[PDB]
Symmetry: D2
Subunit: 334 residues, 4 copies
């Protein structure tokens, strides 16, 4: 029903496409990227991390043909020239990573789209939404340039919410042991971050993250109470958040796990999950949820300090949330 | 001067051997391992993580010959038949990973040695020492079977001591993002630990660690105040400790780093180092200290919760501490 | 239909089980391994390379339950005590890697089995079969202990057959760039083979292979004509054969390629596959065929020397051939 | 003595700098790159593959200071604006990877340099040289735009020569199992080569190479007799050439290796090396020669077809040859 257009057919752009495939509410009608149709068709079909796409993919001229439907392919470096209006694209997924500033993303609205979903933290956006945490604050009349936050914020917020409501967070530190991404280097080379300039697959690479702070965007009561960092490691996909927090209430591992398990089966079902199996990162490659609690890792010291570990497929979970967001927006009245 | 014998010529045994070459006080005279002299010579000469041994290594009979010195090579699976006393071996480094209980390690003293140093946490040891933290509690009469603790406790204890003495630690939790060891599997295979049963170079593997509890063995004032877990990752060597602690005094990042820098330059010189460079794990490969503070990572929320990150070459740093301990015991009288 | 028992639930045993799931003719009813049921079930369900087993798996007592069926789990290191017959096991899949000598594998026959299939090269086996090559020489009276050869031989044989019948192989060399296996080491440690004693995920490790010579067992005409080596690399699965050969006839890439494609859709369908896509190893992870010609790599020099490259998932292609052999044998008579 | 300028301070540029340090005849006086002095200084001091630079390095304003010597750092994207003459640079090392066509490479000559060395196969260059093979064909009044060929060609050529002179190469095929380079992608991304568009550390990626045919540039006699391909694998540095050749003479493995060993100690000493140790890739990391025969791998079928395997540090051995070429050209008169 809702016609979607994707700007930047990269790791997130292609996985949003895959995610959209199984959703009948949304419909991707066009993609824009710097690469050509044939190169794009090849990368959509064969994925080193998620396997082959089970859908027939072809190229008809300058367009992709997926399961008989023609997807238009544009090669506009400048968003302003996209003409989303002519093709009837309602919602645009901004996933180039170049246009997270409102002044850039809005160029899509001026080009013909009705809503823009920036797939990353943004600046001067109308609203940052984390599904399961605050999609209710979205106003169809007021918000048009929306941010879906980072994969890490989507992983942390859902459970920081439950921890906050049930016991109360005084302050907390977090660390995400995260898989490497296309922002890193294969072998030592210039990068604006001297840590990310180092061979990605060869080391544990500490780097900064704003995901901790961003939680305040969706959970205002936590402003100034959380901070953290990231450690990029030699894995191609899937990451894990490690949150150590000072609680207001005295608690037990049993109480904490039970609270998390409850949310995962109730209110946050589909966003937050709960596991008691001794699994590893590879086991989570492909999970569509935003945050899966690794229940076995939960610990408490002095009844007030806690450690909660949650898994997340940074490409898949996130891409599913983008599609869910799109579908939610469409339903609230486009 | 003091003759040493190494039991278990593996990753730690060979690196202890490499460390001893640069120490005039200790003298390695014999090694015991299940492998044959030729295999052991090859593995000592060429190392995938540390490169070529800068010394002449050859085989004479079924004995090793290093830089002209003949090293007796034994092959007794039962420590009771090593006859250390006959060849004048006073100190034995127990690094097979199988004789960590005082009862077993003690078989070396029966074979004639005067002291045994277990290169790992032990059960029932006379004392557990972390050089720079509690070596002064070593008693020549009462302590024969000593544990050098884990590579992780050796990294944590030195700065936890500083944080404690300077600001007071109320409680803290740690996570070590650690390189894989010979205790894991290349491909999925039977293992006591179902996390460690999974392909080491393919996932982030949360695993348990007693390393945070063990700090209380060397710093009793911290008994019951710390806890933590581990995460094994696809790197062959070098690990990092991530410590989050609730302090008593309100501090700033500058105060925390200044204290750390001062100790690295003072009392803990040689054991605790300090760095303000944006480096990655591969850069600490070969580091001989026990803990190198990543100053650029220090963080603080609410003036009371601090985050400190420290690097450690789990093989080289620990192996150097073993040699330092052997040298310190010898100087106390054997 | 035909009852099968698996000896050694390792990578090949668990993948033979998985492949067994979609074949109506055979039925796995018992497994024997060094590990416990809970461990065996965990590793059967979660696989770091192939993913979650899409089947309900659980432990009932000392037994496994997989989609309602209860699989008998035993722990006998001595195959003579397995009592295959009491439980009706017709065919035994010997995949421990320890009993490759006929005298050893024959213990299962002493135990009540009727046929044994060694999942690797053997010594004094009654016959070595490569499905699609010489399975027609199996004689239910004459052969009881059969070898399914190596993953490499199953990859090389099918296309070396075609090439030989078509143009005449005068002589040729092969090199298999193979993923690492459980036979290698994570970090430097003792090994019969000093190349394989080195950290598996850190290097390109040259090693021997009898795969080229073993082709003579299934194709006598090629006796004394082929030879080769292996190079183990940092991937956990999927390998490729690189064959360079001198033909008797003068050929063109087109001809060589047409010959191979023709066979893939003809006689060798399901065993030999043909590809004109520019794919990479991870794309073949999960392929059930034995050999997939990488058509774009075929080269010819002087119209007489050819180069052919074929991919193979060493775990899946092989485990499927094992299941096929079991099914073929049974159809021939037990 | 001779003043050198490096255009493109990447993997090859920094390693050419390092090698240059060890040569008294050459003096690197300037570097041109897209990154700033601080970034460049950091990347030169810390290498993920080669370790810390054994030198005193600092940034004096906008220049590098290495052991007292100041290195002018420029940020020109267009070589025409480089002004090499202004600073006295006689030889320019073109290592950006973007100016291999004579039209671009010569812009250096126009900007004032006297000679240009292209660190890769070139187009319309005056001469392609492989040290130890045809450096003597260098004509100082004619040859101003020189290509040092590729790392692969530098590995193959030296031994292709010896085999030819001694037994006569009728024809041969080569495969290079090569480490990934900065030309590949960390994760699936657009690339003109759909093979190299795939996650570099996750697969065995077959790709093309012109290194076999390029041997004809330096050993004209072998024009039309060789061809081959490459396989990029998940290792950061060090590669191996696998050559299968049809010889004119009847040979034995001993005959083959004896020829190679002699050459390594004779004419090609310093370029070609010989090894009878069972080593692996990491062992060759840091090797300065261009090719090292893995003697244990030499194989022969029918006394006419040989297989020779040679290791090569693609970054170090090559950079040394670049510096050797610069020192040689200069000796002839600039
Ligand atoms: N990967 C992950 O785990 C997650 C990433 N994100 C965010 O998603 C965004 C994309 O990241 P990711 O998909 O990983 O990165 P990629 O590099 O894989 O993808 C970005 C795609 O956009 C293309 N592109 C760049 N500029 C243009 C342009 N001007 N017009 C059209 N297309 C263009 C790129 O091509 P090219 O660069 O080759 O020119 C590339 O194909 C980033 O902002 C990232 O922070 C959010 C959650 C998770
Ligand atoms: N790896 C690291 O970073 C650290 C490890 N340690 C500890 O040090 C110990 C060794 O670890 P690591 O070196 O990594 O392991 P390795 O497996 O590399 O070394 C252990 C060695 O002991 C040999 N061995 C086993 N049993 C005997 C025996 N009964 N008699 C003689 N030799 C024997 C083993 O041979 P084989 O395998 O053939 O049985 C192997 O060669 C463990 O306690 C570990 O926890 C401490 C700090 C760091
Ligand atoms: N992996 C591949 O690519 C291929 C391997 N093969 C062959 O299959 C055999 C196994 O290969 P792979 O699966 O990779 O090896 P694994 O190590 O994964 O599997 C071997 C299994 O046998 C078990 N085992 C060993 N001894 C006994 C015993 N005495 N009694 C009961 N169970 C035992 C092992 O348990 P434990 O470790 O606890 O002792 C292990 O789980 C080898 O011969 C190999 O060459 C053939 C084709 C392909
Ligand atoms: N790596 C190896 O094993 C070998 C490589 N070579 C060849 O050497 C060349 C360099 O390769 P390599 O060092 O591997 O690759 P790198 O990408 O690491 O090096 C290229 C360097 O040149 C810089 N650069 C790019 N464009 C310009 C420009 N317009 N002006 C100034 N500087 C520029 C790059 O900056 P930036 O990162 O911002 O684009 C980078 O620092 C290639 O031709 C390659 O084929 C030859 C033998 C071996």
């Amino acid at each position: 029903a809702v016609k979607v257009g994707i700007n930047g057919f990269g790791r997130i752009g292609r996985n949003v496409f895959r995610a959209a495939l199984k959703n009948p509410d949304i419909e991707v009608v066009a993609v824009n990227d710097t690469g050509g149709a044939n190169t794009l068709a090849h990368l959509l079909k064969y994925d080193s991390v998620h396997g082959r796409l089970d859908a027939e993919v072809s190229v008809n001229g300058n367009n992709l043909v997926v399961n008989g439907k023609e997807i238009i392919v544009k090669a506009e470096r400048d968003p302003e020239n996209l003409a989303w209006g002519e093709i009837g694209v309602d919602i645009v997924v901004e996933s180039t990573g170049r246009f997270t500033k409102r002044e850039d993303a809005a160029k899509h609205l001026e080009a013909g789209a009705k809503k823009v979903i920036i797939s990353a933290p943004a600046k001067n956006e109308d609203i940052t939404i984390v599904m399961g945490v605050n999609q209710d604050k979205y106003d169809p009349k007021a918000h048009h340039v929306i941010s879906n936050a980072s994969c890490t914020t989507n992983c942390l917020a859902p459970f920081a919410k439950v921890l906050h409501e049930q016991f109360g967070i005084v302050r907390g530190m977090m660390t995400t042991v995260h898989s490497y991404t296309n922002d890193q280097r294969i072998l030592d080379a210039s990068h604006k971050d001297l840590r990310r300039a180092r061979a990605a697959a060869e080391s544990i690479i500490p780097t900064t993250t704003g995901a901790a702070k961003a939680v305040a965007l969706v959970l205002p009561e936590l402003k100034g109470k959380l901070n953290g960092m990231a450690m990029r490691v030699p894995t191609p996909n899937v990451s894990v958040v490690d949150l150590v927090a000072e609680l207001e209430k005295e608690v037990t591992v049993e109480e904490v796990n039970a609270a998390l398990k409850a949310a995962a089966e109730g209110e946050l079902k589909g966003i937050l999950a709960y596991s008691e199996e001794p699994l590893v990162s590879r086991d989570y490659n492909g999970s569509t949820v935003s945050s899966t609690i690794d229940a076995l890792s939960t610990m408490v010291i002095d009844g007030k300090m806690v450690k909660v570990v949650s898994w997340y497929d940074n490409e898949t979970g996130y891409s599913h949330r983008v599609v869910d967001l799109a579908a939610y927006i469409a339903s609230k009245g486009l």
